[PDB]
Design a protein around this motif. Structure first.
Motif, PDB file in Angstrom:
ATOM      1  N   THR A 159       0.859  -1.194   0.097  1.00  0.00           N
ATOM      2  CA  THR A 159       0.211  -0.043  -0.078  1.00  0.00           C
ATOM      3  C   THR A 159       0.800   1.209   0.056  1.00  0.00           C
ATOM      4  OG1 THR A 159      -0.136   0.015   2.390  1.00  0.00           O
ATOM      5  CG2 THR A 159      -1.794  -1.182   1.367  1.00  0.00           C
ATOM      6  N   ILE A 160       1.927   1.311   0.871  1.00  0.00           N
ATOM      7  CA  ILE A 160       2.707   2.414   0.880  1.00  0.00           C
ATOM      8  C   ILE A 160       3.349   2.671  -0.627  1.00  0.00           C
ATOM      9  CG2 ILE A 160       5.088   3.227   1.795  1.00  0.00           C
ATOM     10  CD1 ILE A 160       4.063   1.426   4.223  1.00  0.00           C
ATOM     11  N   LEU A 161       3.752   1.522  -1.179  1.00  0.00           N
ATOM     12  CA  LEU A 161       4.647   1.792  -2.387  1.00  0.00           C
ATOM     13  C   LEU A 161       3.519   2.227  -3.562  1.00  0.00           C
ATOM     14  CD1 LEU A 161       7.665   1.587  -3.358  1.00  0.00           C
ATOM     15  CD2 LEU A 161       7.138   0.516  -1.217  1.00  0.00           C
ATOM     16  N   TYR A 162       2.583   1.737  -3.588  1.00  0.00           N
ATOM     17  CA  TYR A 162       1.492   1.826  -4.728  1.00  0.00           C
ATOM     18  C   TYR A 162       0.983   3.276  -4.441  1.00  0.00           C
ATOM     19  CZ  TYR A 162       1.456  -2.815  -6.295  1.00  0.00           C
ATOM     20  OH  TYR A 162       1.964  -4.093  -6.684  1.00  0.00           O
ATOM     21  N   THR A 163       0.597   3.863  -3.071  1.00  0.00           N
ATOM     22  CA  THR A 163       0.185   4.933  -2.923  1.00  0.00           C
ATOM     23  C   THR A 163       1.187   6.268  -3.301  1.00  0.00           C
ATOM     24  OG1 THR A 163      -1.288   4.263  -1.418  1.00  0.00           O
ATOM     25  CG2 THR A 163      -0.757   6.750  -0.952  1.00  0.00           C
ATOM     26  N   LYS A 164       2.301   5.806  -2.919  1.00  0.00           N
ATOM     27  CA  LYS A 164       3.530   6.872  -3.174  1.00  0.00           C
ATOM     28  C   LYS A 164       3.631   7.154  -4.860  1.00  0.00           C
ATOM     29  CE  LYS A 164       6.960   7.437   0.312  1.00  0.00           C
ATOM     30  NZ  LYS A 164       6.555   6.970   1.666  1.00  0.00           N
ATOM     31  N   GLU A 185      -5.091  -0.847 -10.316  1.00  0.00           N
ATOM     32  CA  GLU A 185      -5.739  -2.413 -10.320  1.00  0.00           C
ATOM     33  C   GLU A 185      -4.877  -3.066  -9.325  1.00  0.00           C
ATOM     34  OE1 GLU A 185      -5.001  -3.811 -14.277  1.00  0.00           O
ATOM     35  OE2 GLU A 185      -6.040  -2.010 -14.795  1.00  0.00           O
ATOM     36  N   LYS A 186      -3.387  -3.047  -8.961  1.00  0.00           N
ATOM     37  CA  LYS A 186      -2.850  -3.719  -7.950  1.00  0.00           C
ATOM     38  C   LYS A 186      -3.181  -3.210  -6.834  1.00  0.00           C
ATOM     39  CE  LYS A 186       1.114  -5.305 -10.760  1.00  0.00           C
ATOM     40  NZ  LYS A 186       0.416  -6.522 -11.013  1.00  0.00           N
ATOM     41  N   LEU A 187      -3.449  -1.982  -6.386  1.00  0.00           N
ATOM     42  CA  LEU A 187      -3.875  -1.453  -5.011  1.00  0.00           C
ATOM     43  C   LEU A 187      -5.320  -2.137  -4.773  1.00  0.00           C
ATOM     44  CD1 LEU A 187      -3.015   0.189  -2.763  1.00  0.00           C
ATOM     45  CD2 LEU A 187      -3.934   2.255  -3.700  1.00  0.00           C
ATOM     46  N   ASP A 188      -6.249  -2.252  -5.668  1.00  0.00           N
ATOM     47  CA  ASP A 188      -7.480  -2.673  -5.348  1.00  0.00           C
ATOM     48  C   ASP A 188      -7.412  -3.995  -5.013  1.00  0.00           C
ATOM     49  OD1 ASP A 188      -8.636  -0.421  -6.081  1.00  0.00           O
ATOM     50  OD2 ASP A 188      -9.187  -0.804  -8.172  1.00  0.00           O
ATOM     51  N   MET A 189      -6.478  -4.830  -5.695  1.00  0.00           N
ATOM     52  CA  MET A 189      -6.489  -6.321  -5.335  1.00  0.00           C
ATOM     53  C   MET A 189      -5.893  -6.394  -3.813  1.00  0.00           C
ATOM     54  SD  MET A 189      -7.448  -6.013  -8.069  1.00  0.00           S
ATOM     55  CE  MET A 189      -8.465  -7.307  -7.542  1.00  0.00           C
ATOM     56  N   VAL A 190      -4.837  -5.456  -3.638  1.00  0.00           N
ATOM     57  CA  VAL A 190      -4.199  -5.597  -2.292  1.00  0.00           C
ATOM     58  C   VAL A 190      -5.143  -5.253  -1.064  1.00  0.00           C
ATOM     59  CG1 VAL A 190      -2.570  -4.005  -0.925  1.00  0.00           C
ATOM     60  CG2 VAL A 190      -1.616  -4.961  -3.097  1.00  0.00           C
ATOM     61  N   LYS A 191      -5.978  -4.214  -1.456  1.00  0.00           N
ATOM     62  CA  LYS A 191      -7.095  -3.759  -0.360  1.00  0.00           C
ATOM     63  C   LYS A 191      -8.028  -5.079  -0.294  1.00  0.00           C
ATOM     64  CE  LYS A 191      -6.795   0.890  -1.073  1.00  0.00           C
ATOM     65  NZ  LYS A 191      -5.430   0.849  -0.354  1.00  0.00           N
ATOM     66  N   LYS A 229      -3.201 -15.854  -1.160  1.00  0.00           N
ATOM     67  CA  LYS A 229      -4.073 -15.689  -2.254  1.00  0.00           C
ATOM     68  C   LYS A 229      -4.015 -14.346  -2.921  1.00  0.00           C
ATOM     69  CE  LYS A 229      -8.351 -16.565  -0.728  1.00  0.00           C
ATOM     70  NZ  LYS A 229      -9.342 -16.374   0.409  1.00  0.00           N
ATOM     71  N   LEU A 230      -3.225 -13.268  -2.414  1.00  0.00           N
ATOM     72  CA  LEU A 230      -3.064 -12.222  -2.865  1.00  0.00           C
ATOM     73  C   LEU A 230      -1.938 -12.150  -3.797  1.00  0.00           C
ATOM     74  CD1 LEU A 230      -3.025  -8.981  -2.758  1.00  0.00           C
ATOM     75  CD2 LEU A 230      -1.551  -9.072  -0.822  1.00  0.00           C
ATOM     76  N   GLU A 231      -0.894 -13.187  -3.568  1.00  0.00           N
ATOM     77  CA  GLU A 231       0.131 -13.487  -4.270  1.00  0.00           C
ATOM     78  C   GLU A 231      -0.626 -14.172  -5.866  1.00  0.00           C
ATOM     79  OE1 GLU A 231       2.916 -15.729  -2.325  1.00  0.00           O
ATOM     80  OE2 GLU A 231       4.219 -14.259  -1.792  1.00  0.00           O
ATOM     81  N   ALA A 232      -1.330 -14.918  -5.678  1.00  0.00           N
ATOM     82  CA  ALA A 232      -2.137 -15.481  -6.843  1.00  0.00           C
ATOM     83  C   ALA A 232      -2.671 -14.491  -7.629  1.00  0.00           C
ATOM     84  CB  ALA A 232      -3.056 -16.494  -6.149  1.00  0.00           C
ATOM     85  N   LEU A 233      -3.473 -13.474  -6.779  1.00  0.00           N
ATOM     86  CA  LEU A 233      -4.099 -12.474  -7.521  1.00  0.00           C
ATOM     87  C   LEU A 233      -3.196 -11.543  -8.519  1.00  0.00           C
ATOM     88  CD1 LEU A 233      -6.780 -13.431  -6.096  1.00  0.00           C
ATOM     89  CD2 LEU A 233      -7.245 -11.062  -5.490  1.00  0.00           C
TER      90      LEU A 233
END
Ligand code: CDL
Ligand code: CDL
Ligand code: CDL
Ligand code: 3PE
Ligand code: GTP
Lengths: 48, 98, 115, 344, 70, 320, 112
Positions: free
Chosen positions: G21-26, G50-56, G63-67
């Motif tokens: 989240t930190i990296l994507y938001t930055k 897209e990546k941040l949405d999946m992270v949330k 499962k997050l890695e799979a996503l």
């Protein structure tokens, strides 16, 4: 209350003061005892 | 006995002369200190053996022990000296003149 | 006399072999043959430059341990003493001191090599 | 240094001289000397700077050479007399060699050039230990053989030491070198009397130690290692000035202070033994010491040298370094002349 | 009108390496305030070793010029 | 039990106390870069102690009563005078710079003591490692003299090497016109007189000597003003910094002990600041020095030792 | 917690979701400074959102890695940091600007 940093010697080291005073009185007592004993021994050895 | 002892005395004297007269290298001076130690060891051992004073022969081995300890200290000092001034030449050992 | 004789014969044999080796073969001497060797390409510097030793500490420790071996060697004669208690106690003390010194130099990363 | 290394090295430093003083066998005394040398070296080379390595190397070479010559004296005595202690019939040359080598170990002139450099290239606390404790073991051996020593050689060493140290102290502007040259002078005085009455040698050694230790503590109080640095005492720490003045004067030897008693009693004994010429020369030349001490007193206590702005901040901080021993030893070394009879 | 106290000129007398100067010592300088002396950097030179081509471990044709300390 | 070899042996071992956030972080930047704003939030979020930038009166505030002292006692230097007249003939420029460097040295010692004693990291707005930028700016302008620069360099050489460098260095970069505008907005009459040449020399030093040198020994985190806004971002970067390449990695218990012993005695920290080099700007002179010293020791609570002044309120002196 | 990451040198991350989240938001913050028409801005924002949405959405690490389809979450973190650094470099370069120059007449002609 006044010092921004509490002073290192803020309060007496009661152990230190007790040790000092007790040692002083002990030395004085022992010294007078030894003086009396040595005077007695001197008189005994020299026949008064 | 007497001639051998005289010769050993001369050997020690020559080693001491070499020690007191430097020549650029500190390790060489340490070696001269060693030479003096060896001459003294031999003199002591010869004296003990000739006197048959077996109670004194521990003393020479202690001579060797302490000489080795001193040599080790000297070599460590050499390590420091080289790590500083790049070599072991005693000419560079003159910072405290002032 | 016998030890001198045998050792002198050994020395003479070795020297005779050296002399035969140096005076029998045909010699053709030129500079390229006589220059140092380094895997095909000429040297880039002298071989007398300082060559830092990464085990100097253990070298001096080897001096000290050699002297402690020196202290130990009289044991075969010592064990014949009549003061066995003192002899054994002193030997144990010496070996324990050796071990503790080694342990200190180990724990201070002394036996390791500088890089 | 870690606690174990500190404990071991300090124990060895303490042991060396104890072994030398308590041992009967000359070789065990030599063992004590060797202990002292080996154990002191690392403490000297603690700071691991070029000057420290220089001083350590000089000390090691000089002391090792002197110790080997001492060991030669012992070995030749063994050959001569089948024993391990110098006897009345030991050869004069053997005893003279022992005297020379112990002189070089102690730092007496002419065998003195090494000392000032070693004292200059090392921290102040190690300066104290070197100029005090390390003199005990060598002096013990001489005190043990005072009947046998050659007065001619001893008095040559004494007179030369006085002259050289007194002349040397004048030029130096470095506190450690000044202390070293003062050590050489007082050592000349201690050795002058050894042939005649060794108890006075011990007296002078103790006076010298009680006078020197507190001086080194005072210098350490601010790391004042130069005349200019000490000149700022009137601002950095004013209260110490009176002791610095009185102790310097005592070391000089002005009567009302304790430092007089050594020189006075030594002259008394020397003239009792008819050493008038030497005593007069030594008493004369022991005044340049007073001169180059009076100059320090001028610089520190009797005038106010220019000071530094940043010392204002120093004034704000609090300091805790002056131990109890500074006070005790300073008073004991300056105000003890009245009790002189008990000391001799 | 006021007690003279030492000035910079007076105090700089006691600043030289030796006070009573001489021609021989004129080139001396005061020792550093801390004992450390600003010494010329020692250029550490590391040996250079060919390590080939003709070496059993060089696969035949490598001149891996190595720079070694120890 | 005052820290000593005995205390270290019986306990009080630093490596035991050091935790994740037992670090030294130092903000840096040109004037009015938001340094205090960033530092206060960094400290509050990361649980560390905030250290306001060292000023002329830092020592006065840290010792004794804590109230600012008269400038005579506090250094006889004035930033206001520095701005009003840079090339003053009273040495105000270099007196100011030397006094501020020494104050920064003292503050760094205090922060190191806190870190080593309790293992709570410390946030410093500027450091003795970055103080030289102002001196370089002064010299590049005609303010101070080469001999003053030599004195400053020698004192730094003597003092700086003893201590450890900061764990992380944060430089908030703001351009010269922007800092000039911010100074105008703040509107301090003396500060407004600063010159863009002086500010530019500050920036040139910061980006040509400081950050290059610091990068060798510490983690550097350069930012712009808009990045500096929102401390959470900087805090996150610090939080995920991996720490390496530094002298801090070779320390142990018996190195921290000696460093702590050095730091704990403040006079030993400041010892070399008072070296007797007679620079006419810093040479007070005997009469003025004596007057100032006597007045200071006459100030309330500064006559005797901390715990010994009765006028202040200390009690039980006869058994202390 | 993962015992290790198969790749050598990649240290397991204790707080992967927060780091991501930190990296994507930055990176989302950085991309705002780009011009709106910047194709880099548009595409990278799509990808990061897209990546941040999946992270949330997905809390489980596996499962997050799979996503995310990036393999190990540590590698995903590394790639996020790479994207941030590249975003800064692109901001410096200004690639959105037109072609710098035309090739000579027949530079890319083959067969010659
Ligand atoms: C005539 C023949 C008979 C002989 C008679 C005797 C003749 C007199 C002998 C000659 C006298 C000279 C003696 C010199 C002694 C050492 C001089 C020296 O360099 O130290 C200066 C020393 C500096 O101490 P400091 O200022 O407290 O240092 C700060 C410490 O680090 C403060 O923190 P610290 O904790 O590190 O303190 C040091 C620490 C260090 O302890 C050790 O290193 C040794 C043991 C450590 C074990 C762990 O010791 C301890 O605290 C105890 C550890 C538990 O000052 C002195 O003690 C000298 C006092 C003068 C004594 C002379 C008396 C003559 C009469
Ligand atoms: C009222 C006035 C009080 C004055 C107070 C302070 C004055 C401040 C000035 C300090 C500097 C001047 C002191 C110089 C001095 O004491 O005389 C030199 C004084 C001259 O000694 P000595 O009469 O020629 O004979 C000593 C024998 O070689 C060695 O053996 P010894 O048969 O002669 O007897 C040694 C004696 C030594 O007694 C001492 O404690 C003397 C220590 C004097 C230190 C200063 C007080 O006894 C002990 O060692 C203590 C026995 C403890 C175990 C008993 C069971 O130097 C010594 O006593 C050191 C000898 C080694 C003893 C350890
Ligand atoms: C004699 C050698 C004189 C050398 C020159 C020393 C000197 O110039 O002093 C620094 C002087 C600078 O004076 P300052 O800047 O005004 O402040 C220094 C005070 O410590 C400013 O501090 P304070 O005023 O707060 O403390 C003054 C202190 C008084 O402490 C002193 O400042 C005077 C200490 C030396 C008194 C000498 C008495 C002479 C006896 C003749 C026998 O306490 C008293 O007022 C009464 C205490 C009872 C007198 C203390 C006696 C204890 C030592 C006795 C040893 C005697 C050795 C002879 O220069
Ligand atoms: C008596 C004569 C002593 C031997 C003199 C040898 C030549 C000499 O210069 O003595 C000092 C020598 C250092 O000389 P060096 O460093 O080589 O510089 C060149 C100086 N012309 O130092 C040395 O080479 C050491 C000399 C030791 C001599 C021991 C044996 C002497 C036998 C007679
Ligand atoms: N000449 C000089 N001025 C200095 C020095 N250190 C600080 N200053 C000045 O002191 C003032 C400090 O202001 P700021 O830069 O804003 O520092 P701050 O107020 O504590 O924190 P920020 O507002 O965020 O920047 C500046 O005018 C500058 C120095 O070493 N030399």
């Amino acid at each position: 209350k006044f010092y921004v940093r509490e002073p290192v010697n803020a309060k007496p080291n009661w152990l230190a003061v007790g040790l000092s005073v007790g040692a002083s009185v002990f030395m004085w007592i022992y010294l007078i005892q030894t003086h009396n004993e040595d005077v007695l021994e001197y008189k005994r050895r020299n026949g008064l | 006995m007497p001639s051998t002892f005289f010769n050993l005395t001369m050997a020690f004297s020559l080693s001491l002369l070499g020690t007191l007269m430097f020549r650029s290298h500190l390790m060489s001076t340490l070696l001269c200190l060693e030479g003096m130690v060896l001459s003294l060891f031999i003199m002591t051992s010869v004296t003990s053996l000739n006197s048959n004073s077996m109670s004194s022969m521990p003393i020479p081995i202690t001579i060797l022990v302490f000489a080795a300890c001193e040599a080790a200290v000297g070599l460590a000092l050499l390590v420091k000296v080289s790590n500083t001034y790049g070599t072991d030449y005693v000419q560079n050992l003159n910072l405290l003149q002032c | 006399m016998n030890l001198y004789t045998v050792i002198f014969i050994n020395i003479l044999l070795s020297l005779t072999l050296i002399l035969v080796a140096f005076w029998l073969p045909q010699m053709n001497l030129y500079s390229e043959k006589a220059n140092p060797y380094e895997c095909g390409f000429d040297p880039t510097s002298s071989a007398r430059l300082p060559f830092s030793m990464k085990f100097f500490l253990v070298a001096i420790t080897f001096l000290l341990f050699d002297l402690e071996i020196a202290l130990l060697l009289p044991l075969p004669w010592a064990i014949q003493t009549i003061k066995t208690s003192t002899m054994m106690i002193m030997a144990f003390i010496l070996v324990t001191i050796l071990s503790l010194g080694l342990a200190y130099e180990w724990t201070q990363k002394g036996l390791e090599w500088t890089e | 240094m870690n606690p174990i290394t500190l404990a071991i090295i300090y124990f060895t430093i303490f042991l060396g001289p104890v072994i030398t003083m308590s041992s009967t066998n000359l070789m065990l005394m030599w063992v004590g000397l060797e202990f002292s040398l080996l154990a002191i070296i690392p403490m000297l080379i603690n700071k691991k700077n070029p000057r420290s390595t220089e001083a350590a190397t000089k000390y090691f070479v000089t002391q090792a050479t002197a110790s080997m010559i001492i060991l030669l004296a012992i070995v030749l005595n063994y050959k001569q007399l089948g024993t391990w202690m110098f006897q009345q019939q030991t050869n004069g040359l053997i005893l003279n060699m022992t005297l020379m080598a112990l002189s070089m170990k102690l730092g007496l002139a002419p065998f003195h050039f090494w000392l000032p450099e070693v004292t200059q290239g090392i921290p102040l606390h190690m300066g104290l230990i070197l100029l005090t404790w390390q003199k005990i073991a060598p002096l013990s051996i001489l005190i043990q053989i005072y009947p046998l020593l050659n007065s001619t050689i001893i008095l040559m060493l004494a007179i030369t030491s006085i002259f050289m140290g007194a002349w040397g102290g004048l030029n130096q502007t470095q506190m450690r070198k000044i202390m070293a040259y003062s050590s050489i002078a007082h050592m000349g005085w201690m050795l002058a009397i050894l042939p005649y009455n060794p108890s006075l040698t011990l007296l002078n050694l103790m006076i010298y130690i009680i006078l020197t230790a507190p001086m080194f503590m005072a210098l350490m109080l601010n790391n004042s290692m130069t005349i200019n640095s000490i000149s700022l005492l009137w601002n950095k720490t004013p209260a110490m000035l009176t002791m610095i003045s009185l102790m310097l004067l005592s070391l000089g030897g002005l009567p009302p202070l304790t430092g007089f008693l050594p020189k006075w009693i030594i002259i008394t004994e020397l003239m009792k033994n008819n050493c008038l010429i030497m005593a007069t020369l030594m008493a004369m030349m022991a005044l340049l010491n007073l001169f180059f001490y009076t100059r320090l007193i001028y610089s520190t206590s009797l005038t106010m040298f220019p000071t530094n702005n940043n010392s204002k901040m120093m004034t704000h901080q609090t300091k805790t370094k002056p131990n109890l021993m500074f006070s005790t030893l300073a008073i004991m070394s300056t105000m003890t002349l009245p009790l002189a009879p008990q000391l001799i | 009108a006021r007690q003279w106290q030492p000035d910079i000129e007076w105090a700089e007398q006691f600043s030289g390496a030796v006070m009573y100067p001489s021609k021989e010592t004129a080139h001396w300088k005061p020792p550093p305030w801390n004992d450390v002396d600003i010494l010329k950097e020692k250029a550490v030179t590391n040996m250079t070793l060919n390590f080939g081509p003709q070496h059993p471990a060089a696969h035949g044709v490598l001149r891996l010029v190595l720079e070694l300390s120890g | 039990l005052r820290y000593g070899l005995l205390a270290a042996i019986l306990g009080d071992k630093t490596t035991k106390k050091l935790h994740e956030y037992s670090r030294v972080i130092t903000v840096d930047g040109n004037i009015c870069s938001g340094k205090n704003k960033l530092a206060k939030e960094i400290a509050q979020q990361l649980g560390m102690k905030h250290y306001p930038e060292a000023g002329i009166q830092y020592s006065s505030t840290t010792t004794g009563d804590g109230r600012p002292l008269d400038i005579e006692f506090s250094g006889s230097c004035s930033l206001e005078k520095f701005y009003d007249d840079p090339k003053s003939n009273d040495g105000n420029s270099y007196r100011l710079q030397s006094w501020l460097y020494a104050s920064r040295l003292l503050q760094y010692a205090d922060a190191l003591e806190h870190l080593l004693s309790t293992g709570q990291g410390v946030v410093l707005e500027r450091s003795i490692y970055s103080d030289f930028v102002f001196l370089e700016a002064m010299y590049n302008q005609g303010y101070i003299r080469k001999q003053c620069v030599d004195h400053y360099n020698e004192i730094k050489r003597l003092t700086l090497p003893e201590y450890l460098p900061p764990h992380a260095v944060i430089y908030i970069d703001v351009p010269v016109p922007e800092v000039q505008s911010r100074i105008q907005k703040k509107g301090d009459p003396h500060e407004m007189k600063v010159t863009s040449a002086y500010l530019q020399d500050i920036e040139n030093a910061y980006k040509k000597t400081f950050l290059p040198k610091m990068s060798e020994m510490c983690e550097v985190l350069v930012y712009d003003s808009w990045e500096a806004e929102d401390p959470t971002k900087v805090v996150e970067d610090i939080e995920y910094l991996k720490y390496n390449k530094g002298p801090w990695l070779k320390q142990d218990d018996w190195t921290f002990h000696y460093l702590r012993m050095l730091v704990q005695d403040k006079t030993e920290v400041l010892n070399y600041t008072t070296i007797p080099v007679y620079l006419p700007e810093i040479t007070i002179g005997a009469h003025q020095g004596s007057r100032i010293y006597n007045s200071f020791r006459e100030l309330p609570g500064r006559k005797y030792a901390p715990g010994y002044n009765a006028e202040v309120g200390d009690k039980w002196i006869w058994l202390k | 917690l993962k015992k290790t990451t198969g790749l050598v040198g990649l240290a397991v991350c204790d707080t992967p979701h927060e780091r991501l989240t930190i990296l994507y938001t930055k990176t989302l913050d950085i991309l705002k400074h780009f011009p709106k028409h910047a194709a880099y801005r548009k595409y990278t924002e799509q990808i990061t959102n897209e990546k941040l949405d999946m992270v949330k959405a997905e809390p489980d690490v596996k499962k997050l890695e799979a996503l995310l389809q990036g393999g190990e979450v540590e590698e995903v973190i590394l790639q996020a940091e790479k994207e941030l650094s590249l975003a800064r470099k692109m901001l410096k370069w200004k690639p959105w600007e037109p072609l710098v120059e035309e090739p000579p007449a027949n530079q890319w002609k083959w067969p010659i």
